[PDB]
Each structure stands twice: as C-alpha cells, then as structure tokens.
C-alpha cells in the first residue's frame with residue numbers, strides 16, 4: 001500500500017437494549033488547533049470488530065454529519081441508538 | 095492528550 005486516503009463506510013445494527021453494545025470507544029483529540037475523532041478501542045468479540053472497525057481509524061462522519069460538527073450531546077444521542085452509521089479513514093495494517 | 099472518550 002502507499003499514502004493514499006481510504007475511507008470505510010460502516011452500518012451497524014443491534015437490539016435496542018442497555019445490554020447490547022457495539023463494543024467500541026471513541027476519543028476526541030486536539031492537536032495544534034485541529035480536533036479529530038478517533039476509534040480509541042474495539043472490543044475483540046463485539047459487533048464493531050465484526051464489522052471491521054479498527055482502533056486508530058479516524059472518524060470522519062457519524063450519521064451523515066461531520067465529526068468536527070459533533071458535540072457530546074449528539075454523540076450520546078447517536079450512540080444510544082440501535083443502529084449507527086460511521087465513515088472512517090482507515091489505514092492498511094502493513 | 096485526549097479531551098474525552100465515549101463508549102457504546
């Protein structure tokens with residue numbers, strides 16, 4: 001592979017309960033005045049893993065909205081739903 | 095540093 005940007009669109013669906021999780025976390029990181037959202041972890045046995053979400057992927061959009069336009073209230077709202085759309089920048093592993 | 099973190 002090389003340096004080209006590759007994005008991955010993911011749609012995850014699950015039961016609507018407080019016991020059924022996607023199995024991933026995200027972080028907000030600021031560096032030199034630019035904020036990015038990253039996949040912070042992916043549970044090895046979870047739905048997000050099954051769907052090919054990778055730790056270190058950069059989240060570009062959630063549910064058709066730019067990551068930099070997302071606040072914590074929006075994230076809570078979106079993440080509590082039984083389906084979720086993610087657009088991530090993803091890197092070749094090697 | 096990370097500002098914060100959410101899981102679902």
Ligand SMILES: *S(=O)(=O)c1cccc2c(N(C)C)cccc12
Nearest residue numbers: 027029030031038040056095096
């Ligand atoms: S920060 O510089 O202490 C910090 C801590 C942990 C992770 C970080 C990342 N990851 C790629 C998410 C980027 C920038 C800073 C940072």
Ligand SMILES: [Cl-]
Nearest residue numbers: 024041042043
């Ligand atoms: Cl996790």
Ligand SMILES: [Cl-]
Nearest residue numbers: 095096097098
């Ligand atoms: Cl930190």
Ligand code: NA
Nearest residue numbers: 027095096097
């Ligand atoms: Na840390």
